[PDB]
Design a protein around this ligand. Structure first.
Ligand SMILES: [Ca+2]
Ligand SMILES: [Ca+2]
Ligand SMILES: [Ca+2]
Ligand SMILES: [Ca+2]
Ligand SMILES: [Ca+2]
Ligand SMILES: [Ca+2]
Lengths: 164, 164, 164, 181, 164, 181
């Protein structure tokens, strides 16, 4: 059948937060989940027209010394159009996490499994499952290298050969 | 499926048409049906991302003396994008009613049952089932006070915390 | 049916504890669990009259370096009227935890599942499941940013449209 | 298969479009407003030749067909005015599109004609040909229109009168084509 | 088995043979069949390590006037390492065809069904099922434009992110 | 039948040669002569990589096929010397064509290895892959050869030793082609 099931785990974001610039509410990461953001899924969506996100998980992997103060709040807004970047908006989303800067965590988001479009278009809601937003909570004492990883699983349909 | 079913009746529109200003074709009520228009569904959509309209009925309840002249035509255009506001557009659609200003009527429209988005976006067809139009038929004689109510039932999904 | 089941996880409290001010017995957090304290539940209780707490958990997420001395005791008094803020009173409650300032923990409280009232009134016992109290144990060496999160699940009944 | 000088054309389904479409609907064929005193006896409130162009959806459907037959035709005189209005109306469907006789007697002579007061609604169930008519216009309009609906005042109207003339039509379209005005 | 089955038709070769240069035995098309040669299988092998050829057929579709002279012979050598490019080598193999320049033919070859490697290596026998050769038979009279297409079906395995 | 611009080609049986041929035989893969005293312990009497080229009829048959599978493979060490000869031999078939380990222990580790005196003949029944091998040569010889047969001296030979190493082979050839060196 045209449907092929792919899974993988890749880094959606890499950010560096210097010491003291991580004020409360600062936006460390704001990544709109698109197939191009994921390498293997990037090629897979380059050879397909439609994709549906069966499973989606995120892993916040901040690489900082244990003596680092402050923390982060990480969430997955299931609306690509939504631009709210406050603590309450993230915490309202299912699976959002709050953790110290030296404590890696996992986000298990909730979203609607609809058949999306691999290629971009006018309406972003038909192409992306949502956005991942990672904000600072409090103040960080050291420099934090944050890697945001995404464990994904998709179903691909309508074969084609697209261009970026 | 963590889908919340919510229902109730609420006033979508309140219009005061003064005597003599209700010429034929005058747009008394023009309301794109979005959850923010409904009072209780307003908060329900404020705490959710997606909604599906299971039941939708409109009740035109104009309050005026029985000796008033003229009438109204009310209809639900299933296309939110459509901007045609005339008697012809309303008569073409199904569920439309025409009645004297003292009469109370029910519009049972043809609406999409797909999963629409609570927030606003580039495409209105993904956010609203349609719009409701209430127009004058003839010329009124007394001051008309028309309230358009709606019995609605929705299914809500994808928790979040939206903003106005 | 009128009953709708909602769940979510949100921050009931955000506190900052400077270095040295966290003396033993100091009250870091004292939050009376009310629907307004939870954003999504805030809107949900704004569109309902009665609510019953089916599940209630709390997560103490203190964001401090590993070299921080002292700790905290966290508990959920199932009496909103009770004002005792001592170690023994918290420890007597079911699910109370004691932990180092750099060690996040979870409180699984015990409470009576009674149908409460979303809106406030004269008697606080008919509107709130209880209070969360977080006290210092010993002395803290560094500054601690404490986020108290609440994973809740409620059943809502008697639809209405309340005001704050 | 040998290589020929030219191969035969392989167009097969050409000239095989749908022939018959049954289209029904209801539309406002007229709307009139009468200020007090203007509606003297014999005043022509409504004069509408029933053609596919008069009915919008039927007009668009007739732009892609050659012939049409009126299976069902009924009219509603719906005057939206109070019961304190004096005067009345006579409504009738002349089966002759060409006849331009606008009198009470001419309308009353036709079958299904209605005489009512301005605060009473009526249904005109007329006599119309079932023969195939031409969707497009021509020299003789007796081949393209079933007739015309006429509405006159019977007496002087005391108040302002708002009258809407509606039509339930059912037609069968045939001989597919692509007409242009 | 997380094996992805992918299939489709794609042009492996495009050759423009000018009139008079198509002497007998001239190598119009010489293509070692690797996934990088195929457009869509190119990306598929870019996101996978190993592939197995389940279905393989070649379609010689030359576009030239019917009055042109000469012909072609097309054949699939199942050995990628073999460098013999003559009529004898093509006639020995199975699935080979010989036809006039205006005719369209299908080569149904004999190919290995083992698990080959998408990337290149020291041994070509572990990376490609073989090569396809299209040679002239006689001398052409008109300018010939020959496109060699391939209906292919593969099974892909061992996810990765390769480079050209 | 009309005259076309060009007629279709009528070549039908093209690319339909025989695919499978079972070929059996027996051939001398090696012959060695040892003067007295040269056959010290560990001396490599015979070192032959079993390939289609080593077997002449199989070589000619593999020049017209792409792949071959060894259905049967057995070896005979037949030393034609008297019983008064001292010393002995160890013979074994290494299933790895690439391995060039030439010792008593390496041979004895293999299945079917034989240790005999110079006046005794032995049959090596080895362990060989049944998978399809490539008739033609390539970069990696593990895809083209089942292995190599090795024959060493165990002790010093008192007299001259004439040893002939024979092989019974049965192969199935597949994927017809026309190979050239
Ligand atoms: Ca696309
Ligand atoms: Ca939204
Ligand atoms: Ca209340
Ligand atoms: Ca015509
Ligand atoms: Ca590789
Ligand atoms: Ca070969």
């Amino acid at each position: 059948t045209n449907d092929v099931h792919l899974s993988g785990m890749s880094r959606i974001s890499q950010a560096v937060l210097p010491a003291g610039t991580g004020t409360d509410g600062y936006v460390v990461v704001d990544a709109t989940i698109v197939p191009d953001l994921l390498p293997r899924l990037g090629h897979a969506a380059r050879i397909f027209q439609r994709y549906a996100v069966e499973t989606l998980e995120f892993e916040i992997q901040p690489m900082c010394p244990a003596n680092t103060g402050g923390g982060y709040v990480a969430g997955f807004l299931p609306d690509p159009t939504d631009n709210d970047h406050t603590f309450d908006a993230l915490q309202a989303t299912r699976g959002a996490v709050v953790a110290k800067w030296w404590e890696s965590r996992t986000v298990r988001p909730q979203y609607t499994r609809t058949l999306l479009w691999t290629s971009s278009g006018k309406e972003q809601r038909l192409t992306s499952p949502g956005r991942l937003i990672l904000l600072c909570v409090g103040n960080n004492t050291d420099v934090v290298n944050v890697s945001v990883l995404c464990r994904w699983s998709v179903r691909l349909s309508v074969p084609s050969l697209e261009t970026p």
